[PDB]
Amino acid sequence: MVNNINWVKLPVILDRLLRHPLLTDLNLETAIQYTLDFISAMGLPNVYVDKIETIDIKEYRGELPCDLISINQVRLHKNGIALRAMTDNFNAYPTHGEPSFKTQGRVIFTSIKHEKVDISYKAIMLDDEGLPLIPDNPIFLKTLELYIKKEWFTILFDMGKISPAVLNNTQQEYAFKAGQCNNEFVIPSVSEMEAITNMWNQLIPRVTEFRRGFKNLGDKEYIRVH
Amino acid sequence: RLNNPSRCHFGIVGSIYNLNDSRPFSLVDMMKPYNYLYDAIHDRLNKAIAS
């Protein structure tokens, strides 16, 4: 992403929506739900807060943080070796290898009995109130505005309180701004293209940056001169 | 030398492989530009191989 994620409070979107006379029954309560829906539907990883938090494994099981949404990595605390996805169907079940993990709810199922594991996860940036905090990018703001307007107009169209042409226009505009917002947050910046370039050109390919925390992924590959 | 008392020199004997009282244009001199072009083009080749 080229631009920086400067955070602003949620009613910034209600400042802009309520300019429309047909959206004056919208509320913070509705904006919260539709904002969370938009955040998930776009799935942008720059909108989440990166956190690292250690936990203990009692026996092939560990308690997971409260605010976790998605895991970047899990690794062993003492070695630093990363874990992979668990493909085993009988992990801690005995009868009569490398470490891996599997997470469903508040519980992470590892293949290790008693160790500390480090989890690098993504959460939502919250407010002084326990509420979501949105980027102030006017592209993001316009796209979220258009998302909420599209949902409200879809309800009102299901009633027959909006013309089909009005909803068709709203859907067209939301679709274009959704694509544009997707490209805004995903296209790398200059530093991210230097990292991608140093990942791309290897005379000797590097294929083991998962073992580390992808630390050396964008490190330049130097060849000595002979 | 027998007849000339002024003819003398040192132990050093040699020659310049030059043309008409000029500085010598050696074999390495006349192969060097090609070697530099070879090195540059092979640099492009290696960078292509990496990518």
Alpha helices in chain A (DSSP H): 11-17, 28-42, 138-159, 164-186, 190-200
Q: How many Cβ atoms are within 10 Å of A50's Cβ, its own excluded?
A: 11
Would you give the DSSP letter of residue A87?
A: -
**Residue A147 CB-density burial (10 A; 0-12 exposed, 13-18 middle, 19+ buried):** buried
Contact A35, A222 (CB under 8 A): no
Experimental method: cryo-EM
**How are the residues of chain A apportioned to helix, strand and coil, as percentages rounded to the nearest 5?**
35, 20, 45
Which residue in chain B is spatially nearest to A221 when comparing CA positions? B50
**How are the residues of chain B apportioned to helix, strand and coil, as percentages rounded to the nearest 5?**
45, 0, 55
Interface touch A203/B50, C-beta < 8 Å: yes
Q: Distance between CA atoms of A46 and A4, rounded to whole angstroms?
A: 9
Q: Distance between CA atoms of A150 and A172, rounded to whole angstroms?
A: 10
Which residue in chain A is spatially nearest to B46 when comparing CA positions? A203
Report strand pairing: A134-135 vs A116-124.
unpaired
Interface touch B47/A202, C-beta < 8 Å: no
Contact A210, A120 (CB under 8 A): no
Interface touch A203/B51, C-beta < 8 Å: no
Contact A75, A118 (CB under 8 A): yes
Interface touch B47/A201, C-beta < 8 Å: yes
Residue from the list A200, A203, A221 with its beta carbon closest to the beta carbon of B49 = A203
Q: CA quadruple A144, A149, A151, A152: dihedral positive or negative?
A: positive
Would you give the DSSP letter of residue B40?
A: H
**Residue A208 CB-density burial (10 A; 0-12 exposed, 13-18 middle, 19+ buried):** exposed
Count chain A–chain B contacts defined by CB atoms under 8 A: 9
Q: Distance between CA atoms of A19 and B34, rounded to whole angstroms?
A: 71
Contact A74, A101 (CB under 8 A): yes
B34 sits in which H/E element:
helix B27-50
Q: Distance between CA atoms of A56 and A190, rounded to whole angstroms?
A: 39
- Give B37→chain A minimum CA distance, Å: 17
Q: Distance between CA atoms of A221 and B47, rounded to whole angstroms?
A: 12
- Judged by phi (left if over 0) then psi (alpha if -120 to 50, else beta), residue B2 lies in alpha
Closest CA to A60 of A85, A82, A89, A92: A92
